[PDB]
Amino acid sequence: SAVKAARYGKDNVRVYKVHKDEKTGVQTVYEMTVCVLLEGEIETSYTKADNSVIVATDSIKNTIYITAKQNPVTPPELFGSILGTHFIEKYNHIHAAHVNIVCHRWTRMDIDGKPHPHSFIRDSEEKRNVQVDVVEGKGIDIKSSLSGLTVLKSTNSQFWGFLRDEYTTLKETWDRILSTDVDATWQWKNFSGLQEVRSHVPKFDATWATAREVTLKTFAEDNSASVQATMYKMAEQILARQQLIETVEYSLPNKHYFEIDLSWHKGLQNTGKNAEVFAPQSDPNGLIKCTVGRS
Amino acid sequence: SAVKAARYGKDNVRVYKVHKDEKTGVQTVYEMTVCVLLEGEIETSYTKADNSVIVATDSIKNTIYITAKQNPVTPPELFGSILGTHFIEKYNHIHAAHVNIVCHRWTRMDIDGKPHPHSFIRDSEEKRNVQVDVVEGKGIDIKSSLSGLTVLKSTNSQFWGFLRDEYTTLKETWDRILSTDVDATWQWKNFSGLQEVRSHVPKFDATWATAREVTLKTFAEDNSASVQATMYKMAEQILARQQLIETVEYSLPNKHYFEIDLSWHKGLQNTGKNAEVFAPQSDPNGLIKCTVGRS
Amino acid sequence: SAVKAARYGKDNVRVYKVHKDEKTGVQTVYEMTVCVLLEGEIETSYTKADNSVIVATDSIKNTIYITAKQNPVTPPELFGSILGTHFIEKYNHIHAAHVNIVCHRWTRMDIDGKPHPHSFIRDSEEKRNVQVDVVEGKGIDIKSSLSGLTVLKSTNSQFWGFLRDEYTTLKETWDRILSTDVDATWQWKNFSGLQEVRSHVPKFDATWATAREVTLKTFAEDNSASVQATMYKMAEQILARQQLIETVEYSLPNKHYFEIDLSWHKGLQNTGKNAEVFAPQSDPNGLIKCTVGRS
Amino acid sequence: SAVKAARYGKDNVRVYKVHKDEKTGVQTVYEMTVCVLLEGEIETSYTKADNSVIVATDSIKNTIYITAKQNPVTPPELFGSILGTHFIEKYNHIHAAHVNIVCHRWTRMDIDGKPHPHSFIRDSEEKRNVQVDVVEGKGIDIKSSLSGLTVLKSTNSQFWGFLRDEYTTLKETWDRILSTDVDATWQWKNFSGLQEVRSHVPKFDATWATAREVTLKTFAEDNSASVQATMYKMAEQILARQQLIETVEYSLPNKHYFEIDLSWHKGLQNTGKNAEVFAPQSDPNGLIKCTVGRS
Ligand SMILES: O=c1[nH]c(=O)c2nn[nH]c2[nH]1
Ligand SMILES: O=c1[nH]c(=O)c2nn[nH]c2[nH]1
Ligand SMILES: O=c1[nH]c(=O)c2nn[nH]c2[nH]1
Ligand SMILES: O=c1[nH]c(=O)c2nn[nH]c2[nH]1
Ligand SMILES: O=c1[nH]c(=O)c2nn[nH]c2[nH]1
Ligand SMILES: O=c1[nH]c(=O)c2nn[nH]c2[nH]1
Ligand SMILES: O=c1[nH]c(=O)c2nn[nH]c2[nH]1
Ligand SMILES: O=c1[nH]c(=O)c2nn[nH]c2[nH]1
Ligand SMILES: [Ar]
Ligand SMILES: [Ar]
Ligand SMILES: [Ar]
Ligand SMILES: [Ar]
Ligand SMILES: [Ar]
Ligand SMILES: [Ar]
Ligand SMILES: [Ar]
Ligand SMILES: [Ar]
Ligand code: NA
Ligand code: NA
Ligand code: NA
Ligand code: NA
């Protein structure tokens, strides 16, 4: 037996950081959960009880906090690059650092029409994420995402013309509900290293903002032929708005809302154009996925 | 042995309703989760296998959907009243209906700064709830609430002057983070029946709105002496702003964010006035409750 | 306004304790999660910012760990009694301590058919819980329970003879699946204080054991007329088997498994006597509650 | 823009099946949750609103149930092969079917020392899983796993001799608690197709049983130098007990239990050899991973 792959590190490290401004007395809060896993010359920790090669998970945890103290934690693509870079440079035998960050929302409250200096609400469970893979002499690979963006539209979604065979019972429809939790991911052109990441910093926030705006617009506006068809259109527009993106990937549950036939009860009319009351189905769910690239 | 108490029915009934305004084309969606439990002369179903007294849970589920088709599902206080009244009126032997409703958020999307006619986002897992107890002979008892409203302020929270003895290690502070998940409940004066509830319908949405607005402003503006002191201020203000409320209750976790001493590492200064990076603590948590009434 | 009711303290305190028998080398582990909330002359902390009356939640957490070090953590009824008594005795102005304990399973592993001295498996998320209310002047009130015990029988459950009207669609059955998550609670007779609780210690583990054994056997053997009828039988048997119990309560979801009509596909026969494949329904669920006492 | 990859299907399909024996009157229950996603000539459903190529998720759901009716659902490696095979053979344009199955525990109850014919308990939240990738003209790739097997040992785990630098605070130890949730996966030699899978059926259950036995034994018995070192030993033994396995992969959280220093309180002694009461840490957690193969 031989180790074919191994990585190890610290997961679920919660981090908060505050910035306090001088002139303004305005405060800004940032909260994330971090995972850093390491690869390199570590097989012997597995094979020969040889702990000498292990940078302790505990130490990795310390290093996340220290790093957060020493640098801005925003945007997470930068923070993750910085953090990941630290590990491969500091330790000879460590050849890759994989950093996952989930950013939690803390949105400034408006009180009596004006933004509060130091009070925040978690205004959605929606997250902003990165996966930052820092690989020694292979550069920095970044995937940015939004996830947990839960949306519904009450009309202007259709699904007809699919294969019908001896397995099919689904009725065609020209007017249904569409609901999903959006998980959208954009993969950056490889960066040669930390310096290169630093040259692009403003694009990170801008491309997140774009991806979200494009998701919501296309979802709201598209008289959708299918989930397949609507996600495609979103991805097209995202690629067309940022050249440093190689691929855009959506993963979309179809969270079904069934009509309820009430006609058995006093001829109550609640289907087709009369449909008002629906039963949201917790399971199962359609799951539709797509990765889109340049020709 | 004897039955001392008994209730039964259907829990976790998901319900969506859509309104379509045919003039404007604007749709509005409502989604909830409903529990109905019944009490009455039902002891024999437990003692003698007498199913003749059971309105089947399956039937209670049908009834929920039927009632939602036949009536507005909003405000939940009204819907719950209507649903519970149905059971005590329809079935001679049923003497109480206990209706719990959790309302889920579907906030109309703004696309390019105008509200979209039929697209919605779940902005946060905050809920608005009611518990409506319809009791034959004893009118309609309603408790409304909001829950899962998660907030944080980065400053203007203090906690000093608490008891200190051989069990105490907590340092006094004049500047700490305060973060909670707000569960606030207002108990209505007893209503004589459906007719009286229908006559106060506007007060429901307005008292909810007040409860939320006070919570948010008080949390944001109060320079807090404790969770105890700040939650009292919210409750007193809510009572003063709606006469038909008898009590306000808050239940508030103290979601601790601990300073991290980084001084062991390169003399890093991260405590007291220099604290910027903190460790959010998932558990344990303080929990602080109050019920506030009129003197 | 005035405070009508108030309690506060520390929730979600995780506690592990190990016993080591130095003769045998056998270790036993216990793990729980503890909540302590206090009542007393504490109104001024809410009304006047008087922190002098607050035993800090942080201190209550310290106290939990200290008490667990100084005493057996088992049975939970005893531990809870000891912990709650500490608060009402130590602090003049605290008049009640409400102690909730959830005990987690760590079952000793069998390796090659002998029990291992110091290795354990979490066999299921079933819990054993207590709520111990220590009230100055009014003794010690204990409710014990078991919760999260998930069971299913594939046959020997019936449900016919229920009311049928214009709201009913459920077909009668003489053979259906029955599945539940058992939450069962036994309320102890009031104890005068710690001394009396200590004098009945063996009755705790034995009454838990009885409660579980009866639940399991009755569920397995009863040819059930309803959830109502079967849960009553459990409760009556538990009361008859421990005199110091005043009430037994059950709360039981009916976790529905629906037949699937496959006849549209190749005449496939999957209903009634031919039913083998079923669709477990996540929601909604029947919910059936009883409290049973002595006549 | 062009689709670079796409798959779609039905997720979270719950399935129960019962077998009833003639001679014995013994019943056996099986419960799983199924996901099937499809690949093939489907890009046009994304790019050209062309639903003609879509086998409806609804239909895929039907097909899971029908398949379950027509075949044993055990072992899941076979069921998944059968189900996946169905899709690539039935539909010309579908070239791969990816089947994930999670098997839920329903363990026969012993009542009064004898196994009950038709009553079952969910005796752990531990799962048995497969991922079955059926790829047209590439055969059937199977990965089997167990997950959610939560274990703790109170002693006979060590962690010393790791790198110490300016980032390290962790103390070395020769006696600690070790707790983890085991996620162990074994990847089968590629099978050429359904016929080949059928020739190996008994090995599926045997290899699952082996993997579990080996995990628990090695965990209980190994005076572990590190998580890294203990997982390695498990994987070694698994490979050495079944030739049709190419690789074994473990992913193991280190669920930390901290000592609690109580000496500040009355010189209470609770560390090193005196350590009895520990604080279980919900987060963060060490995460250690390893894939092991034949030389
Ligand atoms: O077993 C362990 N492996 C590690 O890599 C580690 N780091 N901190 N503690 C640890 N324990
Ligand atoms: O109302 C329904 N719509 C569907 O799409 C469906 N599929 N299975 N059952 C169903 N019921
Ligand atoms: O606001 C607070 N209330 C309390 O009762 C407390 N105890 N510790 N910290 C605390 N903070
Ligand atoms: O930084 C800390 N603050 C606290 O209030 C506390 N209580 N336990 N440990 C602690 N650490
Ligand atoms: O056991 C049952 N009790 C009920 O009250 C019921 N209602 N529908 N099905 C049911 N099954
Ligand atoms: O098969 C079913 N059984 C039921 O009891 C039921 N109730 N609603 N739909 C149902 N389908
Ligand atoms: O948008 C959809 N895509 C599908 O593949 C599908 N299958 N059933 N319903 C569906 N809706
Ligand atoms: O008791 C502790 N043990 C540890 O391993 C540790 N790491 N950070 N803090 C800690 N406290
Ligand atoms: Ar952060
Ligand atoms: Ar979509
Ligand atoms: Ar609704
Ligand atoms: Ar507060
Ligand atoms: Ar414990
Ligand atoms: Ar039952
Ligand atoms: Ar199954
Ligand atoms: Ar391990
Ligand atoms: Na390196
Ligand atoms: Na009545
Ligand atoms: Na007292
Ligand atoms: Na094919």
Tell me, letter by letter, the H, E, C secondary structure of D219-261. Answer: HHHCCECCHHHHHHHHHHHHHCCCCCEEEEEEEEEECCEEECC
Other Cβ atoms within 10 Å of C121 Cβ, number: 21
**Crossing angle (nearest 10°) for helices B76-90 and B57-70:** 130
Measured between alpha carbons, how far is D240 from D207 in angstroms, rounded to an integer?
11
At residue C65, φ and ψ (nearest 5 deg) are: -65, -40
D150 and D183 Cβ atoms separated by less than 8 Å: no
Token pair recorded at residue B197: 């509830």
Which residue's structure tokens are 């994930």? D100
Which residue's structure tokens are 């009244």? B85
Distance from CA of C24 to the nearest CA of A (A): 29
Which residue's structure tokens are 């979103």? A234
Does the bond joining D76 to the residue before it have cis omega, within 30 degrees of 0?
no
A270 and A260 Cβ atoms separated by less than 8 Å: yes
Closest listed residue to residue D42, CA positions, set D91, D98, D100, D99: D91
Query: β-pairing, C2-20 with C27-40?
Result: antiparallel
Closest listed residue to residue D140, CA positions, set D181, D93, D94, D99: D99
Q: Which residues of A211-224 are buried (b: 16+ CB within 10 A; e: fewer)?
A: bbebbbbbbbbbeb
DSSP letter, residue A52: G
C44 and B290 Cβ atoms separated by less than 8 Å: no
Across the interface, which of C166, C167, C283 has its CB nearest the CB of A282?
C283
The answer to whether B98 is a known catalytic residue is no
Q: Return the bridge partners of A159, or none.
A: A173
Pocket test residue of C169, C170, C175, C176 for ligand 6, highest count of atoms within 8 A of CB? C170
Other Cβ atoms within 10 Å of C164 Cβ, number: 14
Which residue's structure tokens are 């033994």? D237
Query: β-pairing, D2-20 with C277-280?
Result: antiparallel
Measured between alpha carbons, how far is C93 from D177 in angstroms, rounded to an integer?
40
- Between the alpha carbon of residue A230 and those of residues A156, B73, D102, D176, the distances in Å are 11, 31, 30, 53
- Interchain pair D166, B283: CB under 8 A: no
Token pair recorded at residue B85: 């009244």
What's the Rg (C-alpha) of chain C?
24
Interface test with A, best of C255, C263, C266, C282 (most A CBs within 10 A): C282
Q: Which residues of A touch C265 (CB under 8 A)?
A: 166-167
C129 and C100 Cβ atoms separated by less than 8 Å: yes
The response to whether A159 counts as a known ligand-binding position is yes
Measured between alpha carbons, how far is D172 from D158 in angstroms, rounded to an integer?
8
Q: Which residues of C touch A266 (CB under 8 A)?
A: 166
Measured between alpha carbons, how far is B19 from D234 in angstroms, rounded to an integer?
60
Q: Where are the alpha helices (DSSP H) in chain A?
A: 43-47, 57-70, 76-90, 194-198, 202-221, 227-239
Helix, strand, coil fractions of chain C, as percent rounded to 5:
25, 40, 30
A140 and A204 Cβ atoms separated by less than 8 Å: no
Instruction: Decide: residue C285, CB within 10 A, 0-12 exposed, 13-18 middle, 19+ buried.
Output: buried
- Interchain pair C290, B11: CB under 8 A: no
Distance from CA of B166 to the nearest CA of D (A): 7
Could you write out the DSSP letters of every residue in B238-274? HHTT-TTEEEEEEEEEE--EEE---TTTTT---SGGG
Helix, strand, coil fractions of chain A, as percent rounded to 5:
25, 40, 30
A226 and A236 Cβ atoms separated by less than 8 Å: no
Q: Which secondary-structure segment (H or E) carries D104?
A: strand D94-104
Instruction: Decide: residue C112, CB within 10 A, 0-12 exposed, 13-18 middle, 19+ buried.
Output: exposed
Closest listed residue to residue D34, CA positions, set D115, D131, D118: D131
Instruction: Calculate ∠ Cα C258-C260-C263, nearest 5°.
Output: 155
Other Cβ atoms within 10 Å of A202 Cβ, number: 9
At residue A15, φ and ψ (nearest 5 deg) are: -140, 130
Tell whether ligand 5 has an atom less than 6 A from the beta carbon of residue B262: no
Closest listed residue to residue C128, CA positions, set C107, C155, C154, C153: C107
Instruction: Decide: residue D20, CB within 10 A, 0-12 exposed, 13-18 middle, 19+ buried.
Output: middle
Tell whether ligand 16 has an atom less than 6 A from the beta carbon of residue D226: no
Those residues whose C-beta lies under 8 Å from the C-beta of residue C211, and which sit 6 or more positions away, are: C144, C146, C184, C186, C238, C248
Q: Return the bridge partners of A32, or none.
A: A15, A103
Across the interface, which of D7, D55, D61 has its CB nearest the CB of A289?
D7
Instruction: Decide: residue D272, CB within 10 A, 0-12 exposed, 13-18 middle, 19+ buried.
Output: exposed
Measure the N-to-C terminal CA separation of chain B; round to a whole number of Å.
43
- Interchain pair D264, B169: CB under 8 A: yes
Token pair recorded at residue C97: 């301590």
Query: β-pairing, B140-153 with A114-121?
Result: antiparallel
- Interchain pair A283, D12: CB under 8 A: yes
Measured between alpha carbons, how far is C90 from A128 in angstroms, rounded to an integer?
49
Distance from CA of C192 to the nearest CA of D (A): 29
The answer to whether D57 is a known catalytic residue is yes
DSSP letter, residue A265: T
Across the interface, which of A62, A119, A124 has its CB nearest the CB of B124?
A124
Measured between alpha carbons, how far is B53 from B58 in angstroms, rounded to an integer?
14
Number of H helices, E strands in chain C: 6, 12
Encoded amino acid at A249, one letter: E
What's the Rg (C-alpha) of chain A?
24
Measure the N-to-C terminal CA separation of chain A; round to a whole number of Å.
43
Q: Which residues of D71-108 are buried (b: 16+ CB within 10 A; e: fewer)?
A: eebbbbbbbbbbbbbbbbeebeebbbbbbbbbbbbbeb
The neighbours of chain B, by the rule of 3 or more Cβ pairs under 8 Å, are A, C, D
Closest listed residue to residue B152, CA positions, set A69, A113, A108, C56: A108
Tell whether ligand 11 has an atom less than 6 A from the beta carbon of residue B16: yes
Measured between alpha carbons, how far is A249 from D250 in angstroms, rounded to an integer?
28
D38 and D87 Cβ atoms separated by less than 8 Å: yes
Resolution to one decimal, Å: 1.8
Homologous superfamily of the B1-295 domain (CATH)? Urate Oxidase; (3.10.270.10)
- Between the alpha carbon of residue A245 and those of residues A128, A135, A183, A201, B283, the distances in Å are 17, 19, 17, 14, 40
Other Cβ atoms within 10 Å of B48 Cβ, number: 12
Experimental technique behind these coordinates: X-ray
